[PDB]
Amino acid sequence: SMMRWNRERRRLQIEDFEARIALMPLLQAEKDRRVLQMLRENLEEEATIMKDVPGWKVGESVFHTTRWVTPMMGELYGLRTGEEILSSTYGFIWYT
Amino acid sequence: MMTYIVFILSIIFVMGFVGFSSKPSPIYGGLGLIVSGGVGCGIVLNFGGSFLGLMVFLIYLGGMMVVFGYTTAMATEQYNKVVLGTFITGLLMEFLMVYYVLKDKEVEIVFKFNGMGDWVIYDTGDSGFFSEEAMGIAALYSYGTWLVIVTGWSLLIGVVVIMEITRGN
Amino acid sequence: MSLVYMNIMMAFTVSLTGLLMYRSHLMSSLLCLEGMMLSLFILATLMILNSHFTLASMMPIILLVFAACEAALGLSLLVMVSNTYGTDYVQNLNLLQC
Amino acid sequence: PGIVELPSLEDLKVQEVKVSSSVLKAAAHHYGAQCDKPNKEFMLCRWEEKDPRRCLEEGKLVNQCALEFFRQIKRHCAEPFTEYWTCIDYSGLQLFRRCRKEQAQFDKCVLDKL
Amino acid sequence: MNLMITLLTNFTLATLLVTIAFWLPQLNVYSEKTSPRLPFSMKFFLVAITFLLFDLEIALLLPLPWASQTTNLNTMLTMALLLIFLLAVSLAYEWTQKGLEWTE
Amino acid sequence: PFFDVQKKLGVDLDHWMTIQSAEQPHRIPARCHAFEKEWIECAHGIGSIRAEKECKIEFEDFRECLLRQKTMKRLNAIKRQRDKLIKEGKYTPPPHHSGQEDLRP
Amino acid sequence: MFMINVLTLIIPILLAVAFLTLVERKVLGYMQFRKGPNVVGPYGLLQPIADAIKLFIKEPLRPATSSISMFILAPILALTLALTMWIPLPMPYPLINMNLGVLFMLAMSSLAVYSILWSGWASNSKYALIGALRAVAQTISYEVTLAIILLSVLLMNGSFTLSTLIITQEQVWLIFPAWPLAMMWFISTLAETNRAPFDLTEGESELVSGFNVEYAAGPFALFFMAEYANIIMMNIFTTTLFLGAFHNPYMPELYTINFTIKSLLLSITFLWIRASYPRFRYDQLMHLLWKNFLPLTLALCMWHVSLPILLSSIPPQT
Amino acid sequence: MWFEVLPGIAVMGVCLFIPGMATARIHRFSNGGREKRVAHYSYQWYLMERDRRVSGVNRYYVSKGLENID
Amino acid sequence: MNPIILIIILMTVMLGTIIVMISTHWLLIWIGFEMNMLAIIPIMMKKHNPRATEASTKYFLTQSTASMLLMMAIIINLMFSGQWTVMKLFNPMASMLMTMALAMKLGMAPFHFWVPEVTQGIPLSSGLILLTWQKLAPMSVLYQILPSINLDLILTLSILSITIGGWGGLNQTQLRKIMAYSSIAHMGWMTAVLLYNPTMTLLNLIIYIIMTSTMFTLFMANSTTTTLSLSHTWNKAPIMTILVLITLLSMGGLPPLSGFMPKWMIIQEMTKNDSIILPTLMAITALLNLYFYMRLTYSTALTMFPSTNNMKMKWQFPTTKRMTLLPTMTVLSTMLLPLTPILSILE
Amino acid sequence: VAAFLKNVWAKEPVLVASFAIAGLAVILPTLSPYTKYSLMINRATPYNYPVPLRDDGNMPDVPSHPQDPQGPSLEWLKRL
Ligand SMILES: CCCCCCCCCCCCCCCCCC(=O)OC[C@H](COP(=O)([O-])OCC[N+](C)(C)C)OC(=O)CCCCCCCCCCCCCCCCC
Ligand SMILES: CCCCCCCCCCCCCCCCCC(=O)OC[C@H](COP(=O)(O)OCCN)OC(=O)CCCCCCCCCCCCCCCCC
Ligand SMILES: CCCCCCCCCCCCCCCCCC(=O)OC[C@H](COP(=O)(O)OCCN)OC(=O)CCCCCCCCCCCCCCCCC
Ligand SMILES: CCCCCCCCCCCCCCCCCC(=O)OC[C@H](COP(=O)(O)OCCN)OC(=O)CCCCCCCCCCCCCCCCC
Ligand SMILES: CCCCCCCCCCCCCCCCCC(=O)OC[C@H](COP(=O)(O)OCCN)OC(=O)CCCCCCCCCCCCCCCCC
């Protein structure tokens, strides 16, 4: 009985994973536009905050490379409120 | 305040270490190490080490500190200045470090330390339908073959060694 | 670097200076030794989870297993010392001065 | 070092797929059957460029073909799809295995009318 | 978060029960009552150490329900049976060298 | 006495946990996979002496990926200047940095 | 709204612990050819209330304690662990749905021996400490087979998730593929909660339970109700683990009725075991663990590792 | 006779029935008449946070179907 | 002890040493040190008297503290390098902590305070294992991490070890403490030349292990643990006095013997790097080692101390001890200086 | 060997069941015909994303669409 039913559970797991795979291009496109939205917002507010500061390059990379670096949590949610910070950075861990 | 939860648990962790390391008695030192192990487990749990934190509770506090309290109960007797003085010494050193790294967002004792909440350094992506921590621990059986061999050999030898040196002959 | 690493390393040094300054009991020394192990466990775990370094997730478990077997060895040494001298005092272990 | 180059907020404007995850998971098999080519162009561009700034046009083509997919569902089979994603949506794990008759009705209407 | 709220609630209810059970029987003023190392066993310490070492072997065994999902199944099954066999060999050496005696 | 028995016999006893850029279970990338791969493929074969002075940029990018010291220092500078401008009243925070804009997806 | 759910977990736990004393005294009455309480309430229903009010206004006994702090913390820890063992229990929905509920319960039950150890420290008698160390060695002995039986069963589940264990048993009770694990599980949980025939503290084979001994002990009601919370919890956990019921996701009350009836039958089975056998001697239950249960548990652990591989029945992770 | 134990068993059974029935009704009240979303894995949490962002009311359990697209 | 269990435990000691010597991962280095200590603890408690329990407890505390400092150095390395290869260390704090941990494992001064106590507390065979085989694995790790070893730290440890191991043996009459302070001085000699040429470090370690194995094997074959019990050897086996004479003259660094070879090669490789004061002070400090060696030769071979009457009964019995490789080790510890360019096989 | 087996089954049947269950667990997966399918099912479970290939011109076995005939199939798993 456990043989038949765990084989059925594996086939159901494959069906769930194929649904996930079929949705991953759309979610990746939305995630890319999401992070570029948040980085552009942080860049514009860095341009309007860091005017009085002498010798400040706005949008200066901390890396010598010109390769795209995956953004950090503090790079995205740095200027936002503490509730959005907590819901993005401890939300899955603190979920139930 | 709530974005600093791992930091506040780490302050409780250092306070517990100053507690038992000032050594009042092995009974209360065991109690302080139990409370310290619990809050350091909470530190691990707030990064996503759920299995490793339950390894802290189940193995560290669950077996080993139970054996420490057991062996203490067979070696101490049930019924100071230096302990309380060293306690408040370590507490003042820790709170002065907290005050510096909070008012300055920067300190340097041995290394340079940020003063913001350690939420900043996390990843912004998902792991899909697994835990990366669980799959890396699960790879002890497919990738950690030599590691399993030397760990099991050390534990078997450890059983042999404890039966040798407690035999008295 | 990150703020929690300061507290975990300072916890290691607090349990170090506890372990490097005995009062009377060998059990309190072993408690400081396993507090050193506990701080090493937490520090390695925070690095490995922060880095998403997948295969080193089994590293703190191997650390925990080896050092708890080490702790069992130390408790058996303390037990043999206590069956020799009646207590676990480190001032009873002074026969090897001469 | 150098200045990071980001696209403007005009270049990040697209008509989003503002549906829920059970609506997507209910439609996911036909979405993977029908919206294959822009999705795989995007994922190939995404694993080769290793940069989401070189993949924004393929992301917009994905986000456009998904909308064409759901409009083509909405013109023919809105009610079996709605019943089916409501049944998917009840479950906390969103099981496919709890919803086989609504899946059968949605697949029947989708195979007939599309 | 909800876990922390639940732990705080269980700790609070437990502390409230303990505080009631110590202070509620102090309401009735009672007649103030005025009338009026432990031996070591090696086997008690040895059963605790045997527990600790087999518990570490169990700590090695705990990632098995995740380890069966691997693509290197022959190596995984070999090392799984090898850890359970080394636990059994530790038990056999504990058996045959009189270690499980008078607490058998 | 590094008796390199592993390279002699061809066995892989511990090279798999050695770096982050190695083969991982289910192909999970480390968060600094590219930086470590660049530093290793730079420093490969040329020895430690040439690697410390010729691959310095790749190793600095990789250390700053790992520890994120320059990133946190930059965010500290921006956040301190932001809080000074808020206290001086010369700056207002936008609605998209206060939770008032109905987020993207 | 969540605190309402926490309280409707933890207050009916205490009420069920209250009436388990009545169910115990009645069912042990009728098995002993007598009645249980029927005078204090109608059919004895006021006996837990009267007995609790009696215990809460009774004097702290005679003596003083060696350590005040552990004398306070041992009932706090006992009740706190006895209440936190219930929050991942899927009945059909856990209060705290976690991915590692099994390992959580195993770890929090491993933490429960500190109450016994600290109550042995907090007593002044050096003989009560010896009895506490015997009890600690018993409980940590049977935690080994708890861990390994639990691992062997979870190899058919796929994860440490307790809610998945309802899905695993949708075609058959899990006692059918794992009845030797189930019976060694049941006897090992019996030996966990210091329950007869393994109750050496509350009985003889004990150096300190010997009539006009010393040892200031805690208020008995708190450790007693922690122990009965643990008894009902380990029987609910055995019910989830081996006798998992039918769950309709649109009617959760069917699963709640079904697991409740099975958990009541299994707790009455604890009551019916304690009224049927004499007690083990201490080395006899050490024998029963170390020479009898642990070899079969390691052999069946090898069997339940290698068996989904040879039958192609490896359960999914998710 | 032996049916005298059934009132105590019945009271204890009602006391065990209350927690599970309670958490099922509270999960259906707090989540729009449906089961509580189970997010054990970070993909499930990602989809759940996406639902919370697309619902427009900061609630994941407000489902948006084909009426939300043109 | 069961001979099967003895053989398995010695194979586990050797296994921990080999795991340190072959592995490319820091966790396996730490695992090898843990396995090594865990297996050598019963060898120290072979006879079950309170001095062996005290010696094993002191050894446990020192090697446990060093293993935890080693893991802290490894963890700081994982911070500042993101990897685990056993090579140079990418932080001076990790390098300092690892050099301290290996200095504690070797018993170099000022972490030397366990070595004469632990060596006195244990038998001669376990003292032989402690002073020869237990030096192999930390010198292998120091051989591998030397691009990051601080020079001032390792030379401070080296000269302090040579000086304290010189002055420590001058007050001793117990043979095991003399060998332990000899160990401290020779470990100073090994680590002084490490950053200059580690091939000469391996040469010093090999010649040291040969000579110390010769002295412990002679002390086992004569069953002598004190100076004054070694003094009766002329009336029991006069060839043994000759062998301990030439081996103590070798360990003092006198030509034409092979104990002159390591210190002459160390001075030879330290003057190349424009260090003159330091090998000269090291060479002059080794005269203290030669002084208490000559004290032992005076008490054993060059004079005849008074014996007792019961030695006449021991005249009637031969040595039935397995004096394993004692002629081979005696020849290699004395007559190897004409083969001094054999050291290139360790390059 | 038949006298010893009945004697150890009379004196220590727990150990006989222990060694029998352990010996079956060792030697049985190498004799079972379904041990192949465990490997086949674990390597067919799609955890990651099937990152597509750039169509260079000569890949006749790789499909262009998931519903194309060529490619790896799981009909053995649907049927068994
Ligand atoms: C989950 C719901 C409940 C589950 C069932 C439990 C309800 C019944 C409870 C009854 C009351 C029990 C009270 C406590 C009793 C404690 C004493 C006791 O029983 O000790 C156990 C006794 C102890 O032995 P003993 O003391 O009786 O015998 C003497 C022992 N020596 C010789 C060592 C001195 O037996 C066991 O340990 C058995 C454990 C479980 C056995 C599982 C059998 C598996 C068989 C597989 C096949 C075997 C055939 C051969 C191989 C074939 C391969 C194909
Ligand atoms: C989840 C379910 C949990 C269930 C928990 C409770 C289980 C048991 C349920 C109750 C069963 C019946 C109880 C009857 C008790 C006795 C009532 C009574 O009449 O007692 C008589 C006594 C004296 O009366 P007197 O005036 O002297 O009469 C002389 C007549 N000429 O009169 C008195 O003493 C005064 C009246 C006392 C009445 C007490 C009734 C029981 C109270 C129990 C507390 C809990 C209540 C329920 C809470 C949960 C549900 C909301
Ligand atoms: C003598 C002192 C007083 C004694 C009485 C009181 C203390 C003893 C009883 C309390 C014990 C507390 C145990 C709490 C942690 C248990 C492990 C855990 O968090 O597991 C639940 C879950 C793991 O499941 P998973 O689904 O993987 O993670 C969520 C991601 N979806 O993970 C989560 O849900 C993570 C949630 C966030 C992290 C929670 C951290 C809790 C707070 C820190 C520890 C508090 C306890 C410290 C003291 C312990 C005992 C000394
Ligand atoms: C880069 C370097 C890589 C590695 C290169 C190789 C390094 C070699 C290091 C050698 C260390 C040897 C340590 C001692 C041997 C270990 C086992 C042992 O203890 O054997 C002695 C044995 C024990 O018997 P037992 O009865 O317990 O002793 C009491 C006396 N009845 O029996 C006795 O006690 C009997 C008395 C005689 C014992 C003599 C043993 C001599 C062994 C060493 C030979 C010399 C080393 C090899 C050649 C040089 C290599 C560099
Ligand atoms: C090959 C597969 C893998 C095998 C390894 C895995 C094993 C899993 C089970 C773990 C067992 C752990 C404990 C083992 C201890 C063995 C030693 C032992 O118990 O010997 C003592 C015993 C007599 O018992 P006694 O000492 O008197 O006990 C006190 C009460 N009288 O002596 C005896 O009763 C005799 C014991 C030896 C003979 C047992 C024969 C059993 C045969 C079963 C069928 C064949 C199974 C295949 C394995 C080969 C067996 C020869």
Tell me the one-letter amino acid at I200. M
Any domain includes C19: yes
Q: How far is CA A64 from the centre of its chain?
A: 23
Between the alpha carbon of residue G239 and those of residues A34, G6, G109, G174, the distances in Å are 46, 22, 17, 10
Query: Based on the number of CB atoms within 10 Å of its own CB, is B125 exposed (0-12), middle (13-18) or buried (19 or more)?
Result: middle
| Residues I1, E7: Cα–Cα separation, whole Å | 52
- F37 CB neighbour count, 10 Å cutoff: 16
CB G316 within 8 A of CB G172: no
Number of domains, chain C: 1
Measured CA distances, B114 to A57, B92, B104, C1 (Å) = 22, 20, 9, 5
Q: How far apart are CA B47 and CA B130, in angstroms?
A: 16
**Helical pair G2-31 and E2-23, crossing angle rounded to 10 deg:** 50
Burial C33-47 (b: 16+ CB within 10 A, else e): bbbbbbbbbbbbbbb
Query: Which domain CATH number covers B137?
Result: 1.20.120.1200
Spatial neighbors of D45 by CB under 8 A, at least 6 apart, are D54, D55, D58
d(CA H60, CA F10): 54
Which tokens belong to F13?
């006893």
C-beta atoms surrounding G13 within 10 Å: 25
Please, which residues have CB within 8 angstroms of residue F60's CB and are 6 or more apart in sequence?
A64
Q: Are I149 and I195 in contact (CB under 8 A)?
A: yes
Nearest alpha-carbon partner for J76 in J45, J42, J31, J37: J37
Closest CA to I154 of I63, I278, I273: I278
How far, in Å, CA of I312 to CA of D55, rounded? Answer: 98
Joined together, the tokens standing for residue H30 give 């707090």
The tokens of A22 are what?
Answer: 């079929």
Residues I115 and I105: their CA atoms lie apart, in Å, by 10
- Dihedral, CA of residue J60, residue J62, residue J64 and residue J67, to nearest 10: 120
Q: Write down how long chain B is.
A: 169
Could you tell me the resolution of this structure in angstroms?
A: 2.8
Q: How distant is the Cα of H66 from the closest Cα of chain F, in angstroms?
A: 16
C98 falls within a domain: no
d(CA B106, CA B108): 7
**Phi, psi values for residue G316, rounded to 5°:** -75, 155
Q: Is residue C95 part of a domain?
A: no
Q: What is the DSSP string of E23-75?
A: HGGGSSPPPPP----PPP-HHHHHHHHHHHHHHHHHHHHTTHHHHTT-S-HHH
Q: How far is G104 from chain D (nearest CA, A)?
A: 21
Given CA atoms B83, B89, B94, B95 in this order, what sign does their dihedral have? positive
Could you give the CA distance from residue G163 to residue H27 in angstroms, rounded to a whole number?
15
Pull the structure tokens for residue B18: 């100053």
CA distance G135 to C21: 35
Helix (H) or strand (E) holding A48: helix A2-49
A63 lines ligand 3 (CB under 6 A): no
Alpha carbons E3 and A52: distance in angstroms, whole number? 46
CATH number of residue C71's parent domain? 1.10.287.3510
Picking from D54, D111, D109, the residue whose alpha carbon sits closest to that of residue D81 is D109
> How many other β-carbons are positioned within 10 Å of the β-carbon of residue G42?
9
Q: What is the largest CA-CA distance in chain D?
A: 60
CA angle F76, F82, F86 (to 5 degrees): 145
Residue B37 structural domain: 4-166
Whole-number Å distance between alpha carbons of B39 and E2: 17
Chains F and A: 3 or more CB pairs within 8 Å of each other: yes
- Report the run of H or E that residue B113 belongs to, with start and end: strand B112-114
CA–CA gap between residue D38 and residue D66 (Å, rounded) = 9
Q: Are I180 and I119 in contact (CB under 8 A)?
A: yes
Q: What is the DSSP string of J6-55?
A: HHHHHH-HHHHHHHHHHHHHHHSTTT-TTHHHHHHHHTTS--S-------
Which helix (H) or strand (E) segment holds residue A9: the answer is helix A2-49
Ligand 4 centroid distance, CA of I244 (Å): 18
One-letter amino acid of C91: Q
Q: How many angstroms separate the CA atoms of I35 and I16, rounded?
A: 5
Burial class (CB in 10 A: 0-12, 13-18, 19+), G178: buried
Q: Domain count of chain E?
A: 1
Task: Choose among I111, I113, I71: nearest CA to I94.
Answer: I71
Whether G187 is in the pocket of ligand 1, judged by its Cβ within 6 Å, is yes
Amino acid identity of residue D96, one-letter, is: F
Q: What is the 3-state secondary structure (H, E, C) of chain I?
A: CCHHHHHHHHHHHHHHHHHHHHCCEHHHHHHHHHHHHHHHHHHHCCCCCHHHHHHHHHHHHHHHHHHHHHHHHHHHHHHHHCCCECCCCCCHHHHHHHHHHHHHHHCCCCCCCCHHHHHHHCCHHHHHHHHHHHHHHHHHHHHHHHHHCCHHHHHHHHHHHHHHHHHHHHHCCEHHHHHHHHHHHHHHHHHHCCCCCHHHHHHHHHHHHHHHHHHHHHHHHHCCCEHHHHHHHHHCCHHHHHHHHHHHHHHCCCCCCCCHHHHHHHHHHHCCCCCCHHHHHHHHHHHHHHHHHHHHHHHHHHCCCCCCCCHHHHCCCCCCCCCCCHHHHHHHHHCCHHHHHHHHHHC
CA C46 to CA C44: how far, in whole Å? 6
Cβ atoms of residues H12 and G16 within 8 Å: yes
Which residues have CB under 8 Å from B143's CB, separation 6+?
C55, E72, F16, F17, F25
CA gap F46, A86 in Å, rounded: 46
Question: Which ligand is in closest contact with the Cα of G186?
Answer: 1
CB contact under 8 A, G155 and E64: yes
Identity of the residue in A7, A11, A18 whose CB atom sits nearest the CB atom of J46: A18
The residue among E55, C66, E86, G142 whose CA lies nearest residue B59 is: E55
**D91 interface with G at CB cutoff 8 Å:** yes
Shortest CA distance to B51 belongs to which of G159, G297, C68, C69? G159
D-contacting chains (≥3 CB pairs under 8 Å): A, F, G, H, J
Count of C-beta atoms within a 10 Å radius of residue G134: 24
Rounded to whole angstroms, the Cα distance separating B164 from B156 reads 12
Phi first, then psi, for residue G46 (nearest 5°) are -100, 0
Task: Provide the residue type at B169 as one letter.
Answer: N
What radius of gyration do chain F's Cα atoms show?
22
The count of other CB atoms within 10 Å of the CB of residue I323 is 16
Asked if E59's CB is within 8 angstroms of C65's CB, the reply is yes
Q: Identify the DSSP state of F74.
A: H
Pocket of ligand 2 (CB under 6 A): G 15, 41-42, 45, 49; H 11, 14-15
The domain ranges of chain G are: 1-318
- Rounded CA-CA distance I212/I134 in Å is 13
Of D59, B3, D45, which Cα lies nearest the Cα of A35? D59
A96 in reach of chain H (CB within 8 A): yes
Compute how many other C-beta atoms are within 10 angstroms of the C-beta atom of residue I276: 11
Q: Which amino acid appears at position I208 of this protein? A: Y
CB-based contacts of I125: which residues, under 8 Å, 6+ apart? I43, I46, I216, I220
Distances (CA, A) of I32 to C70, E83, F94, I27: 13, 19, 58, 9
H helix intervals, chain B? 5-21, 26-45, 50-55, 65-73, 81-103, 132-138, 145-165
Q: What's the sign of the alpha-carbon dihedral F82, F84, F87, F88?
A: negative
**Which of B128, B145, B144 shows the shortest CA–CA distance to B136?**
B144
Encoded tokens for H11 = 């009271």
I10 lines ligand 4 (CB under 6 A): yes
What is the domain range of residue C20?
1-86
Give the helix ranges, DSSP H, for chain G: 2-31, 47-56, 68-84, 101-110, 113-122, 126-154, 164-168, 179-192, 220-242, 252-274, 282-287, 294-311
J37, J74 contact by CB (below 8 A): no
**Residue D30: both structure tokens together:** 């036909």
Which residues, including other chains, have CB under 8 Å from residue J43's CB and lie 6 or more apart?
E71
The C-alpha torsion from B83 through B86 and B92 to B94, rounded to 10°, is -100
> What is the residue-wise DSSP string for A60-72?
B-SSSS-S--PPP
Closest CA to C36 of C12, C69, C4, C70: C12
Terminal CA-to-CA distance of chain D, rounded, Å? Answer: 55
Whole-angstrom CA distances from I61 to I68, I112, I131 are 11, 13, 17
> Tokens standing for F8?
């002699």
I168: nearest Cα among I107, I228, I220: I107
Contact G233, G202 (CB under 8 A): no
Q: Do G232 and G262 form a contact (C-beta atoms < 8 A)?
A: no
CB-CB under 8 Å, F17 with I80 = no
d(CA G306, CA B55): 25
Longest Cα separation, chain F: 70
- Distance, CA of I184 to CA of I161 (rounded, Å): 6
Tell me the C-alpha to C-alpha distance, in Å, between residue I75 and each of C37, C51, I69, I83: 12, 13, 10, 10
Indicate whether residue I72 lines ligand 4 (CB < 6 A): no
User: Please, what is the Cα angle at I245 between I239 and I246, to 5 degrees?
Assistant: 100
Q: If you count them, how many residues does chain F have? A: 105
Token couple for D49: 């460029």
Nearest to C52 among F17, F22, F28 (CB): F28
Q: CA distances (Å), I243 to each of F28, G217, I128, I233, I289, in order?
A: 64, 71, 18, 11, 18
Q: What angle do CA B27, B31, B37 make, to 5 degrees?
A: 140
Tell me whether E59 touches chain C (CB under 8 Å): yes
Q: How far is Cα G21 from Cα H8, in angstroms, rounded to an integer?
A: 9
Distances (CA, A) of H24 to G93, G246, H17, H36, H51: 6, 15, 11, 9, 22
- Name the residue in chain A with its Cα closest to that of J66: A22
Cβ distance of G295 and E104 shorter than 8 Å: no
Tokens of J66: 């998931």
Q: Give the domain range for residue I224.
A: 1-347
Tokens of A39: 């980085």
Contacts of G235 (CB under 8 A, 6+ apart): G189, G263, G266, G267, G269, G270
Query: What is the distance between the terminal CA atoms of chain E, rounded to a whole angstrom?
Result: 45
DSSP secondary structure letter of residue B107: E
Q: Which ligand is nearest to the CA of G285?
A: 1
The widest CA-to-CA distance across chain E, in whole angstroms, is 75
User: Which residues sit opposite G248 in a β-bridge?
Assistant: G251
Residue B106, helix vs strand vs coil: strand
- Count CB atoms within 10 A of the CB of residue E33: 10
Q: Look-up: residue for tokens 């019996």?
A: G190
| Under 8 Å between Cβ of C27 and C78 | yes
Number of domains in chain B: 1
> What is d(CA I263, CA I158) in angstroms, rounded to the nearest whole number?
13
Which residues of chain J are at the B interface, by a Cβ-Cβ cutoff of 8 Å? 47-48
* Residue A91 φ then ψ, to 5°: -70, -45
Contact partners of C by the rule of 3+ C-beta pairs under 8 A? B, E, F, I
The C-alpha atoms of residue D40 and residue G202 are separated, in whole angstroms, by: 70
E90 to each of E13, E99, G290, how far by Cα in Å? 43, 11, 12
- Ligand 3 atom closest to G108 (CA): 11
- Partner residue facing B144 (CB), from C31, C41, C58: C58
G79's tokens? 């009740």
Q: Can you give the residue range of the structural domain that contains E72?
A: 1-104
Residues present in chain G in total: 318
Nearest Cα to Cα of residue G189 among G239, G246, G155:
G239
Domain tally for chain I?
A: 1
Closest to I148 measured CA to CA, from I69, I89, I70: I89
